[PDB]
Amino acid sequence: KIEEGKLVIWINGDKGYNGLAEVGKKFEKDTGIKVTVEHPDKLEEKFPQVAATGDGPDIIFWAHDRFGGYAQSGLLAEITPAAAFQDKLYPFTWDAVRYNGKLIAYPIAVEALSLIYNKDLLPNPPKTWEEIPALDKELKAKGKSALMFNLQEPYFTWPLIAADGGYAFKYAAGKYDIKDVGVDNAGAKAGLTFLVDLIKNKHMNADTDYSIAEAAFNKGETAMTINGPWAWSNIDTSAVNYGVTVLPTFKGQPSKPFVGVLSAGINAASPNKELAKEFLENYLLTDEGLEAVNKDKPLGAVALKSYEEELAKDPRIAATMENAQKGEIMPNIPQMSAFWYAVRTAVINAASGRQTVDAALAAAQTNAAANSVGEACTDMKREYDQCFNRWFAEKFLKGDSSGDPCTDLFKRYQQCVQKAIKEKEIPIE
Amino acid sequence: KIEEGKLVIWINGDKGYNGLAEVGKKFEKDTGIKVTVEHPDKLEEKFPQVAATGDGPDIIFWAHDRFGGYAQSGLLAEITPAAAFQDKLYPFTWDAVRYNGKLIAYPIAVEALSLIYNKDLLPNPPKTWEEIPALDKELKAKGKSALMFNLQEPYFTWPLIAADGGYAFKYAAGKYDIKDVGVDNAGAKAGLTFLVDLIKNKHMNADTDYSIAEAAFNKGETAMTINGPWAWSNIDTSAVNYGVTVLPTFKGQPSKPFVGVLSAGINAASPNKELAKEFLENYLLTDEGLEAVNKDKPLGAVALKSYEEELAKDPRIAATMENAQKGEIMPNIPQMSAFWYAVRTAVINAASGRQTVDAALAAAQTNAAANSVGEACTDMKREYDQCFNRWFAEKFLKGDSSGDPCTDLFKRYQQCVQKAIKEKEIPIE
Amino acid sequence: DKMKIWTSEHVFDHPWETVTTAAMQKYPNPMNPSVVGVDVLDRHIDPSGKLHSHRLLSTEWGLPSIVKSLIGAARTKTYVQEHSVVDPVEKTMELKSTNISFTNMVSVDERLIYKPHPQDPEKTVLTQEAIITVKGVSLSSYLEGLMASTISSNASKGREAMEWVIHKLNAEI
Amino acid sequence: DKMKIWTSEHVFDHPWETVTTAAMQKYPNPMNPSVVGVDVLDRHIDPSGKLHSHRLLSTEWGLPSIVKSLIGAARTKTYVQEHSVVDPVEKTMELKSTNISFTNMVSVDERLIYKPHPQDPEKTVLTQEAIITVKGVSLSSYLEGLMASTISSNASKGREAMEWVIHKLNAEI
Ligand SMILES: OC[C@H]1O[C@H](O[C@H]2[C@H](O)[C@@H](O)[C@@H](O)O[C@@H]2CO)[C@H](O)[C@@H](O)[C@@H]1O
Ligand SMILES: OC[C@H]1O[C@H](O[C@H]2[C@H](O)[C@@H](O)[C@@H](O)O[C@@H]2CO)[C@H](O)[C@@H](O)[C@@H]1O
Ligand code: NA
Ligand code: NA
């Protein structure tokens, strides 16, 4: 149910949506075809829900890791750029957005996390994960917190886990073994242990989210934080002169952060598939359009060769690429959505001290296999199941059902899976 | 049942056995260990018969093609020359005598057939198979025969068969397919047809054997013949000046003659296995010893590098190598003994006009599979079976048996197979 | 038309309420790491009050040597369809499951029932069947039938051999 | 202990004398090109006048793609042992043959008898049996028995799964 002759474009609210909006304006002024840019809360989940019905945006922007899921659950169109266009962008980035040797989205920019510090409070930033507690004591003494970062998304904590050892899926002979999950390995445990210790030792706090930490650091109440190219713009306008540098080392091994290429896919249920291609190739992926976005919020290291050159004189892209090289690129396998919740729930538990590391992490190991068949639906599947197991036990078995259970969570979930089955071509009764 | 402290050595009677005898004399004069050289009739068959019992010579000389049979039927010892010794001989010849990556005999010399002609009668020899009949008419007119050669052994006729097409076993990917036999193919038929035509057109005669043809040509009654390096010595002492040249071409394609390396194996039932190695390496395979043999009868192209050099100035070895290159090397597969009878019987039939080419040759195709399990015994197997099928029908079924059949052909045959089974390691009741 | 290649009865030391609850959320678990995706296709409470669940299971066979090469060529996942019925008054949970992946060729079918233990409501009883149907013909019949097929077939070659040999033999004299 | 996976009767339009003669010299022939070596190990006329033949057959299976590579690794030839008895008065030719190559694992056994045709001495009758013994247990029993083995085995994993899930489930609250 997508209207023809407009374009609607979703991109996360931490990205530079106004910049992107401006690029649409140029597009409208030239073609007369209106462009609408939205930033819906929890978009990683919201797209799938709406995409399954046949609704949603024409263009969807997210880290490439979830695009394999999206594509194989019949939600994305195969992109068909010319050979000349592909030469324009780095082939490394084309690969992040390639599944079963089909291109499923346009790569936009390469993103990875760095250490952002306060140059007025930390003259020289710690090179060492383990030096932080000691520093916090000194800093607390002067009335400040050493480090604060988003402890709610597992992205931000992942670097510290995959440091001493720890992985999503072992990569063997050009394929990922989905049966091999390094969430429960020895160093993954030590990494996560370190984190929790820090909260127990009063140094961090489990509650801290993105905004809490953005606020504090940009207020100058904290010395360091961990964030991406996008966050720089809010630091800039604040009166804190900042550096971006390598992440501290754990056990004298680099902090490894998963790398994502912000890619841009075209909805399978979209009449405007050739407007979407022109907008993406001939307006966004140009020095002009990419600058517009980057001006509003930085994109990290753009996949457009011709603008990455004009940009990598930036000493912050430099530090992003350093850290990017120090970690792994993210898999675009369908099992990724599964993996992410598994660890997401693992981390908070440890952090709020409710489950201990070994328990929460062992849990994750297996929860990582909680995929749906249409892996774009894995998140919807969780919510429907979590609803049914509460009902079945509390209501139905006790003989208090009044009708079919969790009918609204079920409604959409059913559609995703149904669409996914067709795409996967399974035959049922 | 082989005596210790002597050596006994078999080599075919067309080879240079006296020369070889002289080499033994030097050996006896130096060691005091007596050497006895024999040339038993039908040795290709006689060795196996005696070898099976545990009797026979210490050293056996034959074309390499039958050595795979001999070895795998447990009759030959694995030879163990030093790495330095192997460098002394061409590695091409070591291969002819190598089965399952084990060396089974010492190669001595490379042999192939050429066209020997009378330079006084044929000023220029025919380059063309098809020109012969025309020539015979002219030659008959002057009171002579154009060509005469051994029509009894299939070796001599084989070149003319494998000319337009025709093979023993197809060679596929470094192995021979024993199920693929080119005896019954299109050109193999045309080749053999040509031969028989020639007898029908009075040009040749089916009866002609080795001696008949040797005699006539060396008497000067015929212009050409087909024979090997060995035959040259009897031509020399006769008052005919002769040339050796390429075989006539059939259908303008080379005549292909199978090539054999005269090799020398050590009997598995021999106490004298280390005398036999010293005699072979340190007396025979030397410039001295090889000359002795070659003087008596020429060896073709010796496998000893250091004497092949001193020799290939011979314009006849030259012509042997030419023809050798124009055809294939012989397989040392066990199925070879089978192959040889199949064609041997095929050829005479065509020649005596009793069976026609298509019949006799079709027959061969299948008779080529008439192997024993111990393929060294394939010849004994034939004779025992040919005896039993005559008996069973004529005597036993008619109720005139007086006891167990063909008991003496059976006696030895049983032993070969029994020895072969052990070597092949089959388990029976 | 019946041949239950197997059949089994076992007991859990847990009350049916909890065995059934746990059976609903069975996957994914460590003891069955080959079950990688489970989805509820439809669920209805029927006029009699019986909860019906239809579930689809995706299984990836554990052959991790050439898997990267293999999956490019073809999918490595097998699918089984499942139908369960829960009666909350009489306390029974049935479960009929077939493989969908190679059912044209073969069809394994498993039936399971969980009721409380007649002697002790705290324990739960699980009875279990399984039918292999190779071609709708029992495994045994089919497998023997093949032997007919080729045995007689090879037998029929031997009789040609005989005729040919005899023809050559008759031709000799 | 009996299960003749097959059995057959056929007729040749040839007199037993010639069928039998031809059977003695059966190999090698075009219809059986996989039989590459046949050898008579022993032959005796017994006190009653019956000719006994024990023969060994070597067969090379027709898999000519990787044969060169394969035979280096291992032999490509299968062996069957054979026992025949000829009674020249009563005109019968029995023939009992087993494979020797994989008899520890399996054992096909074929029995054949050639007598003249009751109605016409010129024709010859061939009756034929065959027993497959997978483990001395019929093919059918063995093949079903495997299903027991793994079916129940997988069943036993599912029950661990349940316990583990339940343990986690019981642990929640
Ligand atoms: O959460 C903010 C930050 O993280 C994202 O990384 C995601 C990953 O891409 C998702 O699939 C998710 O489940 O896991 C990570 C968060 O835990 C984005 O790559 C990045 O752009 C976004 O700003
Ligand atoms: O026959 C004389 C001549 O031929 C030989 O070639 C043999 C082959 O080696 C044997 O295995 C035999 O059955 O077939 C050919 C004869 O038909 C020898 O190679 C050669 O030395 C010998 O003088
Ligand atoms: Na079914
Ligand atoms: Na047996």
Numbering used by the authors:
A (entry chain A), B (entry chain A): 1 to 429
C (entry chain B), D (entry chain B): -1 to 171
Paper excerpt:
TRIAP1 (yeast Mdm35) and PRELI (yeast Ups) proteins reside within the IMS where they regulate phospholipid metabolism. Thus, lipid transfer proteins of the Ups/PRELI-family shuttle phospholipids across the IMS in a phospholipid specific manner. The partner protein TRIAP1/Mdm35 has an important role in mitochondrial import and folding of the PRELI domain as well modulating its membrane affinity. The Ups/PRELI lipid transfer proteins are widely conserved in eukaryotes and can be classified into two subfamilies by sequence similarity (Ups1/PRELID1 and Ups2/PRELID3).
PRELID3b (previously known as SLMO2) is the human homologue of Ups2 and can functionally replace Ups2 when expressed in ups2Δ yeast cells. A variety of expression constructs were explored to supply suitable reagents for crystallography, including histidine tags on either TRIAP1 or the PRELI domain for purification and a maltose binding protein fusion (MBP) for crystallisation. The structures of PRELID11–173–TRIAP1 and PRELID3b–TRIAP1 were solved by molecular replacement and refined to 1.98 and 2.91 Å resolution, respectively. On one extreme, large movements of the Ω loop and the C-terminal α3 helix away from the core of PRELID3b widens the entrance leading to the inner cavity of the PRELI domain. Furthermore, higher crystallographic B factors observed for the Ω loop also reflects enhanced mobility for this region. PRELID11–173 exhibits the most closed of all the structures while the structure of PRELID3b displays the most open entrance to the lipid binding cavity, and this likely contributes to its ability to readily accept the larger headgroup of PS. Mass spectrometry (MS) identified that a fatty acid, likely an endogenous E. coli lipid molecule, was bound to PRELID1 and the abundant E. coli phospholipid phosphatidylglycerol (PG) was present in PRELID3b. However, the overall hydrophobicity in this region is significantly higher in Ups2/PRELID3b than in Ups1/PRELID1, which harbours additional charged residues in this region. PS release, on the other hand, involved a more extensive overall interface of the protein surface on the membrane at the point of lipid release, consistent with the increased hydrophobicity of the Ω loop in the PS-specific Ups2/PRELID3b proteins.
